[PDB]
Amino acid sequence: NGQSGRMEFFWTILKPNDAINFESNGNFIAPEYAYKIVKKGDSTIMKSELEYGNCN
């Protein structure tokens, strides 16, 4: 995509009442938004080329 540089991303799950501490003097791609997990349940990632069918 035009670039020889690379960005490498990392993730963690931060439990309630824990804290995350970042320190850096360069090259830091910092969080702005994170994702609060508000509903857990059965799901799956389904591999398909189809798109929505407006049905149930």
Binding site: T44, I45, M46, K47
Partner: protein, 176 residues
Amino acid sequence: GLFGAIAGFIEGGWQGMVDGWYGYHHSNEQGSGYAADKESTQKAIDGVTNKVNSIIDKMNTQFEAVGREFNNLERRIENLNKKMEDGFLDVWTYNAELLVLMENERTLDFHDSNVKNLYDKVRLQLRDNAKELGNGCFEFYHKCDNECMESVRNGTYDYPQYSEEARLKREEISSG
């Protein structure tokens, strides 16, 4: 079939017998007609109903494949996952196809058994009060009106009641 009745000594089935799987056709002075054997019919329906349920119940907990993803340097575990999922799907495909062929064999012989046992139920009530014709039919040596026919069909045929009439007729025939 294993029991020798259906497409055996009884040459074919009756399109006219609509209200049972097994039953009777009679002919006497009063007329002729079909009648189901409802007891053997119901027993067989109950058995087949249970069979279908049994087959489905036992397959109720079988293997469910789940998507799992692996990167380009996890090919060994990707392959193990694929073999594992395919392996169970082959086991369960075999179990279903085989169970269906085995039970189908047993269901068709079960019907043959039921027809044979119905024929014998009549044969052993009539004894020598009737002639076995060899084709699934009996020819009575005594007159057998509708109530008498119904006693045969419901297992209450009264052999002693007719034994003298039949003896006289058997002797007339045997004397020529």
